[PDB]
Write an enzyme that holds these catalytic residues in place. Structure first.
Site, short mmCIF file in Angstrom:
data_model
loop_
_atom_site.label_atom_id
_atom_site.label_comp_id
_atom_site.label_asym_id
_atom_site.label_seq_id
_atom_site.Cartn_x
_atom_site.Cartn_y
_atom_site.Cartn_z
N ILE A 307 0.85 -1.20 0.00
CA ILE A 307 0.00 0.00 0.00
C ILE A 307 0.88 1.24 0.00
O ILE A 307 1.83 1.32 0.79
CB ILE A 307 -0.94 -0.02 1.21
N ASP A 351 -6.43 41.07 -19.10
CA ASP A 351 -6.76 42.48 -19.21
C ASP A 351 -5.58 43.23 -19.82
O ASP A 351 -4.42 42.88 -19.60
CB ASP A 351 -7.10 43.03 -17.82
N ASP A 702 -7.20 43.39 -13.33
CA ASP A 702 -6.99 44.27 -12.19
C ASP A 702 -8.19 45.12 -11.79
O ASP A 702 -8.24 45.56 -10.64
CB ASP A 702 -5.80 45.22 -12.45
N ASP A 706 -13.21 43.24 -14.68
CA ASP A 706 -12.66 41.90 -14.80
C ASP A 706 -13.21 40.93 -13.77
O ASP A 706 -13.02 39.72 -13.92
CB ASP A 706 -11.13 41.94 -14.68
#
Ligand SMILES: Nc1ncnc2c1ncn2[C@@H]1O[C@H](COP(=O)(O)OP(=O)(O)CP(=O)(O)O)[C@@H](O)[C@H]1O
Ligand SMILES: [Ca+2]
Ligand SMILES: [Ca+2]
Ligand SMILES: [Mg+2]
Length: 1011
Positions: A307, A351, A702, A706
């Site tokens: 495991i 942007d 910014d 946005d």
């Protein structure tokens, strides 16, 4: 002052003794700061060290080993158990690997928490106040705000303290207070008192609470509570947080962990079943029960050995490392799955203004109408010197000093730029620079009015502070601003209603408009030549737009703005300002005055970041509300397009994208790299369209235009200097506005996923060999080579620190030259499953061959044949087939040590094959990961420790090996490296020796080992 929402504004002002116009004096603040303290909350640490440890024992794979440690403890207690830990070595070594990986998980989470909170102090939060040391608004630190001073707040800002609204400068003030209340919509605020003293924060529609964001409008008020006395500060203890869902990679690895547990369960059941035969062996005293209890511990020890117990710990280790490595690059990673989702990103919508450009605007060009002939005109174009926010510049008509008092058009141009402004200019005496208070576009117009003294004002004795807004003050003293129609992006303009102070009723009232050049000129019916207005024609409009288009597509990529005035405006009572849709109805029948062009330089690190993103298969799309000609010019500057590339079907506007059929809107998002003139609503539509193609989108922005798009993308990155609205709607913040950090976050999220695959490759290909060894021995009939305590030792030294050290692996050399990965493809490939079995088949055969070597070929051991080894259970003194052979030699601890030594050594070599998926050990030497080398030396030291320290070999039932036997261990273990180098070779040259210091280091050892 405890219930300020119930008191009249005059009563709250009189309480602190403050005037709204001027503000709070200096000595008053010193008294209030001495009584109220710093406007800050106490530092809160994330998690307790204890609860951080409990979090490591949450996953299923860790709980299985906790159950096996209990079963190993109860079985050791029912048996003899009359002794100390030396009889509980099996539960002890199961818990060593659990607490070791828990330490590394806690240690790496504590380091990431320390790095993130040490980045919160990067730049202190600021706040605009009115104080009596300056006649204008000044930007001060948020922690320096005292209860009582007048604080100014505009759209996108973060409320710095509890504020009782005194006056709303705009028409409507919308506040986003989901962090405090829980409602998911903007709240309309007013300035009237609410009667209820026990009103809830929902009903306090005249108060603004700290930590909330202004969604729309501009207002000012009186601070009534700071520090812990605020509403968000009083409930900082009642901070029950919602369940943050695990990363999508964690959902893939828990599904894999659950499927792996089912395969382990069937394997350990088969081990107990194939050994049903020899339960009654004389070694178990002929008892079926004691033989069944023994092979039950074989099945439990093989479950622990196979495991991947360190899988949950190595997942959070790589994630915490990625969070710490980003904080060292000034990147606040708020959401944890964000950094690993950024490794899968395929589109980076960005942007333009403020994000792809240093928001350092300065008006360098402007023109007014000189004279207008029949259907044509001549302009008066000027140039302005200066690129910063300092009011030290000069206007040049034709490279000649000019005084703007002569031109009546320049006088009216500066009046619009002064009265249609919500921003101002502030001087930072600490840094010695003029900073902006508001937006960069409006501050550029404030600095412009100062450079052109349209009203000649003597500037000799004025200080640096009073020189910031000196020329703006003499203009504002002339006309009184009645109200403002705030700037809306559906209209792309802003109006201001003014009335002159001197009561001669000459031009009783006017509206001064500024906005997008194409939209404002489309609404101008006349033009202003000097002091005379002339009806506008189509030839004059065509020449005016020609210069604006030449400025945008020019060399310096000027961002343009048209300035107009309305000579005959309606009265305030006639105008219905209950909405923004009616605002455009009033901004009609204007007279064009002039246009200003300001330069916004792109960031220096953007051009190289676009170059590296395209190299990694990522597409960069510019989503801007600015002009199309300006955006295309920026794209050619930062490298989105070529200087000569045709951008016909790659550059779209907002309306051009709307008037497209689904056939072209389909071909747009995959091909378009520039979207201009798009509203905040369209930006979300662009991002959701790209997501409809199952593309991971990383929106960067910014401003408040946005935030709808930042919430829609898989990752939202905000700039550190942007508005607080954008930073709230984002999962990552570039605290230093470094665009290269986004390309580093992509490489980190790719490295995180790579360090998981190297982890999965090491433990599967190694633990399959531990399963093959037990089944191959039972198939050949040999004596079993491992007892339950030796399987738990090989689990401790191979699945522990050497496996966790794969998370510190160095990045691949082509990590960023590969396309983004589909997050929906299967975790393990079919080719990878072959590499796991190929290595696992050798690890098992090498371990069975080591014990068969000692019985058959070794000199110190006996010389039994293959028949006498495959039928060792029927060895008796009366057997003619077994002559001269002792039956006790088949219980020798020498072949069990040969199997245990080969198993540990062949897995340390297998971990060296895991520094990279396909890069050879010659290109990426093991010292690239010094954590793995140190972990291998620690595991091989613990193995030598249990072989030669006095009491230990009897505990694990092993025997000290000599040099000849240790050379055979290396002879068989080393070819696992050559086998992976061959599988890595095929993967490079068919499926997809630089370090000479390394060749001279292993070749002398390879010669010595193989003689
Ligand atoms: N205070 C203001 N007053 C009047 N017009 C403004 C304005 N601020 C911006 N504008 C104009 O509105 C137009 C579109 O609005 P928008 O806010 O989306 O542009 P933007 O400056 O945010 C570019 P980006 O979206 O890349 O940040 C701008 O091109 C600008 O000419
Ligand atoms: Ca294990
Ligand atoms: Ca192992
Ligand atoms: Mg922007």
């Amino acid at each position: 002052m405890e219930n300020a929402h119930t008191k009249t504004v005059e009563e709250v002002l009189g309480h602190f003794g403050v005037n709204e116009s001027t503000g709070l004096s200096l000595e008053q603040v010193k008294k209030l700061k001495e009584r109220w303290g710093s406007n800050e909350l106490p530092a809160e640490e994330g998690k307790t060290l204890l609860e951080l440890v409990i979090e490591q024992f949450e996953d299923l794979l860790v709980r299985i080993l906790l159950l096996a440690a209990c079963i190993s403890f109860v079985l050791a207690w029912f048996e003899e158990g009359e002794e100390t830990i030396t009889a509980f070595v099996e539960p002890f070594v199961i818990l060593l690997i659990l607490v070791a990986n828990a330490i590394v998980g806690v240690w790496q989470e504590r380091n990431a928490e320390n790095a993130i909170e040490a980045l919160k102090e990067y730049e202190p939060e600021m706040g605009k106040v009115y104080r009596q040391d300056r006649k204008s608004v000044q930007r001060i630190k948020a922690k320096d705000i005292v209860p009582g001073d007048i604080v100014e707040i505009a759209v996108g800002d973060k409320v710095p303290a509890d504020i009782r609204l005194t006056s709303i400068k705009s028409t409507t003030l919308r506040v986003d207070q989901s962090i405090l209340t829980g409602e998911s919509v903007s709240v309309i605020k007013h300035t009237d008192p609410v009667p209820d003293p026990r009103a809830v924060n929902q009903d306090k529609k005249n108060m603004l609470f700290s930590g909330t964001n202004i969604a729309a409008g501009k207002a000012m008020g009186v601070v009534v509570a700071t520090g812990v006395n605020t509403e968000i500060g009083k409930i900082r203890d009642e901070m029950v947080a919602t369940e943050q869902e695990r990363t999508p990679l964690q959902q893939k690895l828990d599904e894999f962990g659950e499927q792996l547990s089912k395969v382990i369960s069937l394997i350990c059941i088969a081990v107990w079943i194939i050994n049903i035969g020899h339960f009654n062996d004389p070694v178990h005293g002929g008892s079926w029960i004691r033989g069944a209890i023994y092979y039950f511990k074989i099945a439990v020890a093989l479950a622990v050995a196979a495991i991947p117990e360190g899988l949950p710990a190595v997942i959070t280790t790589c994630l915490a490392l990625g969070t710490r490595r980003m904080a060292k690059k000034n990147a606040i990673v708020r959401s944890l799955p964000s950094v690993e989702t950024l490794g899968c990103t395929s589109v980076i919508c960005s942007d333009k203004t403020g994000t792809l450009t240093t928001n350092q605007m300065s008006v360098c060009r402007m023109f007014i109408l000189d004279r207008v002939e029949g259907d044509t005109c001549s302009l008066n174009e000027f140039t302005i010197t200066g690129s910063t926010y300092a009011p030290i510049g000069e206007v040049h008509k034709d490279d000649k000093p000019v005084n703007c008092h002569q031109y009546d058009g320049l006088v009216e141009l500066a009046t619009i730029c002064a009265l249609c402004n919500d921003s101002a200019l502030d001087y930072n005496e600490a840094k010695g620079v003029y900073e902006k208070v508001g937006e960069a576009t409006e501050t550029a117009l404030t600095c412009l009015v100062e450079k052109m003294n349209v009203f000649d004002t003597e500037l000799k004795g004025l200080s640096k502070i009073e020189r910031a807004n000196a020329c703006n003050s003499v203009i504002k003293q002339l006309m009184k601003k009645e109200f403002t129609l705030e700037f809306s992006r559906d209209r792309k303009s802003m109006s201001v209603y003014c009335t002159p102070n001197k009561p001669s009723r000459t031009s009783m009232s006017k509206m001064f408009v500024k906005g997008a050049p194409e939209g404002v000129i489309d609404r101008c019916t006349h033009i202003r030549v000097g002091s005379t207005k002339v009806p506008m024609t189509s030839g004059v409009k065509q020449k005016i737009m020609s210069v604006i288009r030449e400025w945008g597509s020019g060399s310096d990529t000027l961002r343009c703005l048209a300035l107009a005035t309305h000579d005959n405006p309606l009265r305030r009572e006639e105008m219905h300002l209950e909405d923004s849709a009616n605002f455009i109805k009033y901004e009609t029948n204007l007279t064009f005055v002039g246009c200003v062009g300001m330069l916004d330089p792109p960031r220096i690190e953007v051009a190289s970041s676009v170059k590296l993103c395209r190299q990694a298969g990522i597409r960069v799309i510019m989503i801007t509300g600015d002009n199309k000609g300006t955006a295309v010019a920026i794209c050619r500057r930062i490298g989105i397009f070529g200087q000569d590339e045709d951008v016909t079907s790659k550059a779209f506007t907002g309306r051009e994208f709307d008037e497209l059929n689904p056939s072209a809107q389909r071909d747009a998002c995959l091909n378009a790299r520039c979207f201009a003139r798009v509203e905040p609503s369209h930006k979300s539509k662009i991002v959701e369209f790209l997501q409809s193609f199952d593309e991971i989108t990383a929106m960067t922005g910014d401003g408040v235009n946005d935030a709808p798009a930042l919430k829609k993308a898989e990752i939202g990155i905000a700039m550190g200097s942007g508005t607080a609205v954008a930073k709230t709607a984002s999962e990552m913040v570039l605290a230093d506005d470094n665009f290269s950090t986004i390309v580093a976050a992509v490489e980190e999220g790719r490295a995180i996923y790579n360090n998981m695959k190297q982890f999965i490759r090491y433990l599967i290909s190694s633990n399959v060999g531990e399963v093959v060894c037990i089944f191959l021995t039972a198939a050949l009939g040999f004596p079993e080579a491992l007892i339950p305590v030796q399987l738990l030792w090989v689990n401790l030294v191979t699945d522990g620190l050497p496996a966790t050290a794969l998370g510190f692996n160095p990045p691949d050399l082509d990590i960023m030259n590969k396309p983004p990965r589909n997050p929906k493809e299967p975790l393990i490939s079919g080719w990878l499953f072959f590499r796991y079995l190929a290595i696992g088949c050798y690890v098992g055969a090498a371990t069975v061959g080591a014990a068969a070597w000692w019985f058959i070929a070794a000199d110190g051991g006996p010389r039994v044949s293959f028949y006498q080894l495959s039928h060792f259970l029927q060895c008796k003194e009366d057997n003619p087939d077994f002559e001269g052979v002792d039956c006790a030699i088949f219980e020798s601890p020498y072949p069990m040590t040969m199997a245990l030594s080969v198993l540990v050594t062949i897995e340390m070599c297998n971990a060296l094959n895991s520094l990279s998926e396909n890069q050879s050990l010659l290109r990426m030497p093991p010292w690239e990961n010094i954590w793995l080398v140190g972990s291998i030396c620690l595991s091989m030291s613990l193995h030598f420790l249990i072989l030669y320290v006095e009491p230990l070999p009897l505990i694990f039932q092993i025997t000290p090996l000599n040099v000849t036997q240790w050379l055979m261990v290396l002879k068989i273990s080393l070819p696992v490296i050559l086998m992976d180098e061959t599988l890595k070779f095929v993967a490079r040259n068919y499926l997809e020796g630089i370090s000479w210091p390394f060749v001279l280091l292993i070749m002398p050892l390879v010669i010595w080992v193989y003689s």
